[PDB]
Amino acid sequence: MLKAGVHFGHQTRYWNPKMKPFIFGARNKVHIINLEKTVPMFNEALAELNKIASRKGKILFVGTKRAASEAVKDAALSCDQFFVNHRWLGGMLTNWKTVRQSIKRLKDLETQSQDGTFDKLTKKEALMRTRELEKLENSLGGIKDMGGLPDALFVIDADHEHIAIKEANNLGIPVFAIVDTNSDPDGVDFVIPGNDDAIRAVTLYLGAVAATVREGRS
Amino acid sequence: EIDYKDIATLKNYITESGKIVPSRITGTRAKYQRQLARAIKRARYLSLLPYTDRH
Amino acid sequence: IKVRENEPFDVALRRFKRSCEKAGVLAEVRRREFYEKPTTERKRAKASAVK
Amino acid sequence: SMQDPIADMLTRIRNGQAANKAAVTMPSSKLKVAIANVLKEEGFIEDFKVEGDTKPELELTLKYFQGKAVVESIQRVSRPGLRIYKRKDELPKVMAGLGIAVVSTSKGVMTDRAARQAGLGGEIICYVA
Amino acid sequence: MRHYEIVFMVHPDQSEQVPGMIERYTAAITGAEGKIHRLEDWGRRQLAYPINKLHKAHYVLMNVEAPQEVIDELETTFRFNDAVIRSMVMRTKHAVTEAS
Amino acid sequence: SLSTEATAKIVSEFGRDANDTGSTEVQVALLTAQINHLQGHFAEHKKDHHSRRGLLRMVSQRRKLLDYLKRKDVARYTQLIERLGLRR
RNA sequence: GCUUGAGUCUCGUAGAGGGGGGUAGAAUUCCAGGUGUAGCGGUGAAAUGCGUAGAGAUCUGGAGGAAUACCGGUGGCGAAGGCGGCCCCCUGGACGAAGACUGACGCUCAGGUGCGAAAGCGUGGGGAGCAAACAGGAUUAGAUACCCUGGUAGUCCACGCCGUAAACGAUGUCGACUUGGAGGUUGUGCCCUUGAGGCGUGGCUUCCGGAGCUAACGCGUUAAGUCGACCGCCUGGGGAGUA
Numbered sequence A: 001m002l003k004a005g006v007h008f009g010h011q012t013r014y015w016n017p018k019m020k021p022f023i024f025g026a027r028n029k030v031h032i033i034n035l036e037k038t039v040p041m042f043n044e045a046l047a048e049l050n051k052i053a054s055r056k057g058k059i060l061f062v063g064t065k066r067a068a069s070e071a072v073k074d075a076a077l078s079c080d081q082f083f084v085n086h087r088w089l090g091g092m093l094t095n096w097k098t099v100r101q102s103i104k105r106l107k108d109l110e111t112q113s114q115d116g117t118f119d120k121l122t123k124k125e126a127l128m129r130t131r132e133l134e135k136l137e138n139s140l141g142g143i144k145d146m147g148g149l150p151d152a153l154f155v156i157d158a159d160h161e162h163i164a165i166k167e168a169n170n171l172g173i174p175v176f177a178i179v180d181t182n183s184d185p186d187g188v189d190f191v192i193p194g195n196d197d198a199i200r201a202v203t204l205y206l207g208a209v210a211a212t213v214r215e216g217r218s
Numbered sequence B: 001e002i003d004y005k006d007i008a009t010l011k012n013y014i015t016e017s018g019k020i021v022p023s024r025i026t027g028t029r030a031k032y033q034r035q036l037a038r039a040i041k042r043a044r045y046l047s048l049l050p051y052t053d054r055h
Numbered sequence C: 001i002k003v004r005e006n007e008p009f010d011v012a013l014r015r016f017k018r019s020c021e022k023a024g025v026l027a028e029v030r031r032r033e034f035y036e037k038p039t040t041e042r043k044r045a046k047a048s049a050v051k
Numbered sequence D: 001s002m003q004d005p006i007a008d009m010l011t012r013i014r015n016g017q018a019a020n021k022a023a024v025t026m027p028s029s030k031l032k033v034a035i036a037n038v039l040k041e042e043g044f045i046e047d048f049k050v051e052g053d054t055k056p057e058l059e060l061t062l063k064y065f066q067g068k069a070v071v072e073s074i075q076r077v078s079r080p081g082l083r084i085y086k087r088k089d090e091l092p093k094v095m096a097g098l099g100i101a102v103v104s105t106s107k108g109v110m111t112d113r114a115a116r117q118a119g120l121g122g123e124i125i126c127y128v129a
Numbered sequence E: 001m002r003h004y005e006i007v008f009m010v011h012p013d014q015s016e017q018v019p020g021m022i023e024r025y026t027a028a029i030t031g032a033e034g035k036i037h038r039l040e041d042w043g044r045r046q047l048a049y050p051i052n053k054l055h056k057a058h059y060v061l062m063n064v065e066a067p068q069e070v071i072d073e074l075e076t077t078f079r080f081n082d083a084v085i086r087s088m089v090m091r092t093k094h095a096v097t098e099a100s
Numbered sequence F: 001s002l003s004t005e006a007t008a009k010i011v012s013e014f015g016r017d018a019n020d021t022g023s024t025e026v027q028v029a030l031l032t033a034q035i036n037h038l039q040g041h042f043a044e045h046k047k048d049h050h051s052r053r054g055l056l057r058m059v060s061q062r063r064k065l066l067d068y069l070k071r072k073d074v075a076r077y078t079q080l081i082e083r084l085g086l087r088r
Numbered sequence G: 001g002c003u004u005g006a007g008u009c010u011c012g013u014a015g016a017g018g019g020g021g022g023u024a025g026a027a028u029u030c031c032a033g034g035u036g037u038a039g040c041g042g043u044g045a046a047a048u049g050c051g052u053a054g055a056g057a058u059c060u061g062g063a064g065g066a067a068u069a070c071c072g073g074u075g076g077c078g079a080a081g082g083c084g085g086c087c088c089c090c091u092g093g094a095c096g097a098a099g100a101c102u103g104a105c106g107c108u109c110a111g112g113u114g115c116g117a118a119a120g121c122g123u124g125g126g127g128a129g130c131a132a133a134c135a136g137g138a139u140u141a142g143a144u145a146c147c148c149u150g151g152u153a154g155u156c157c158a159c160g161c162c163g164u165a166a167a168c169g170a171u172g173u174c175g176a177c178u179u180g181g182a183g184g185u186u187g188u189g190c191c192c193u194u195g196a197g198g199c200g201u202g203g204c205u206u207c208c209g210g211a212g213c214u215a216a217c218g219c220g221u222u223a224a225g226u227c228g229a230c231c232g233c234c235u236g237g238g239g240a241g242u243a
């Protein structure tokens, strides 16, 4: 049944009453979530997740923190999937139409990186323009092209991603997310208990989500 | 504490001058800081402890 | 209060007085009676001393 | 003070409901029961339960349908400070007809639909919808 | 019947009227069917500040069980007597022996 | 506020037996007791305004209790006030 | 009739809860004396004041009244007012742990009754410090003030009046119900007491915050949320809490 070796639970006091039903913890000043209730939430989780991924999966593996950002620009990034691994530039969904050209400048630039003007102008402008592009790259990588409108959303840490999720809620976008003992649920349709800032429950489920979009209907 | 006659245990809850030392410094509990003071005030009255360091 | 300082030195060494008396209970008792207004004082001394 | 228990029922409900509380209990009585009945028989609660003898205990199982609580509102209407009584023709109908009014009569605690058919009337205990 | 501590301190120049006093106060309490759960003639002791001119004065401890009546007239006898430079009858809650 | 010896004595003078402590008549009597005891405390002092509040409480408590009994068993009421000596 | 609502009973606990009496040290003022000598005191600066009859400074003895430093703390008690040295006596309430007793005896309460800071009044005391009034010295254009040097009622005690305060949490009392978090304080059960603790279980209290409520600020299990019983009060500002 279990597969999460050592993600057991996490998070001490800072608990959110509403996250009681998914708790059975009480180990030394910290809750262990209800392991045996998290897995029935891979059922439903990766299910309506894939059930749409074959209907065609457009995702947004949204998850930040200089401590798991790169481990999101991964097979999470790779597949039928888009992502954000830095500061969730607010209104990026709700104001996509303004931000849509924050994109044109990323391309119309890199498309021009080993092309267009580049080694020319000044060797001032140079890295003094790749700073324009470096900045853009993180926070606005995964976006690059959005071909199929943001369709579901998968987030690592419910509340830490206040804004992201809120926006979804506003635009009618499923929001699949894992929620720590401390975080507010109910912002999340398909809620996933368990730790949300340890190198494992990430990768595990993260990489496990990459494994279900990346395959649904050949 | 338990007793005002304990001047020995008591003389480590007062300064050179003889001022009671606040619970905050000694880290005592509430219920006892009072028992402490009272025992001190007793012993001062019975000339078992100076009110003052003016002698 | 008391420093019975001994042999090899010339300096005052009485940092003692900045541990109790002087501007302590002295600046205190020097003036306006107070009464119920220290209560208003010390009521800010905890609102402060909470953090 | 304990003075009005029927409001307490109506309320313990109203409250617990709003607290998405599974069940709820309280001191029982002939009267509390007759209503817990109509409440169930009209399908505002799952099912009641009286578990005692010397100190009886009414227990109601609450219901939640969509995400909401089933009982959208529950008010007193008569009360010690001010008793209400309606004749048959003057009986009230809640939410135009949806939801109901609990009226005690010379032939027992029954709804407004009920008492209206029975061709009588009594003390209108409370409103539910 | 209640208890009390009690601890009168006497003027040096009246030192050996202490045996007579103890003798007296106990004869007094015993007399009224009261026990006496501790006794301690601390003798001449040095003072923590000079009280009344003169330093060093003769202490006496007691721990009695006796009725609010003899304990009354004690406190007075203590006043009447201008040889007992201090005195203080105290709490109670149950007898006591040894300490000090 | 009255003695265990004394309070006991009266339970045992008024109730069915020691243990029948909460009998109307007993309460009333052990109140009535403390009231009258007190009459001499407030004889001196008098300005013991605070303690006084407690004493009235005792009277108004007793008063309601006496009222109860009367309604219940009138027979027991009259005996009581006679024996306790009040209600001139 | 019933026992959970309300009482009574038992042993304890904490407390500036009240009333009375006793007592302690520190300082101030004053009185007396040693030493000592021209200043001290006060302000923004001054002056008035005080000192050559020796001031202030210092030391010693004494008288008197008033308040209780340190403890002391969003600490504690009380219905509110409001209650802080220590000790005894008298006394009110609250809380906890066991079970035993009464058996709806309860909640509220117009009228009524009691209590009720400070000031103020009446007779007698009492008077160190403080200080309305008043006097003097200054500041100012003026200065009936703020500042200074003085200082009477008063501030203290008993007895009796007065009955008001932003007397406020500006939030009436009682009861039932409704996510949480970190403290403070006070009982009590259990755990190799083997840790200065470990886990529970009541009373009171502070901060923060969820629903919900609000005009908003904010309140939020100590409600300003959800309901009930009863009482008090509001109905534009001014006139007027006046006639």
Ligand SMILES: [Mg+2]
Pocket: none
């Ligand atoms: Mg003196």
Ligand SMILES: [Mg+2]
Pocket: none
């Ligand atoms: Mg002197």
Ligand SMILES: [Mg+2]
Pocket: none
């Ligand atoms: Mg008591």
Ligand SMILES: [Mg+2]
Pocket: G115
């Ligand atoms: Mg009065």
Ligand SMILES: [Mg+2]
Pocket: none
């Ligand atoms: Mg007055």
Ligand SMILES: [Mg+2]
Pocket: none
């Ligand atoms: Mg007068």
Ligand SMILES: [Mg+2]
Pocket: none
């Ligand atoms: Mg003046």
Ligand SMILES: [Mg+2]
Pocket: none
């Ligand atoms: Mg008024």
Ligand SMILES: [Mg+2]
Pocket: G168, G169
């Ligand atoms: Mg207040």
Ligand SMILES: [Mg+2]
Pocket: G220
């Ligand atoms: Mg709050």
Ligand SMILES: [Mg+2]
Pocket: none
């Ligand atoms: Mg709380």
Ligand SMILES: [Mg+2]
Pocket: none
């Ligand atoms: Mg309310």
Ligand SMILES: [Mg+2]
Pocket: none
């Ligand atoms: Mg008038």
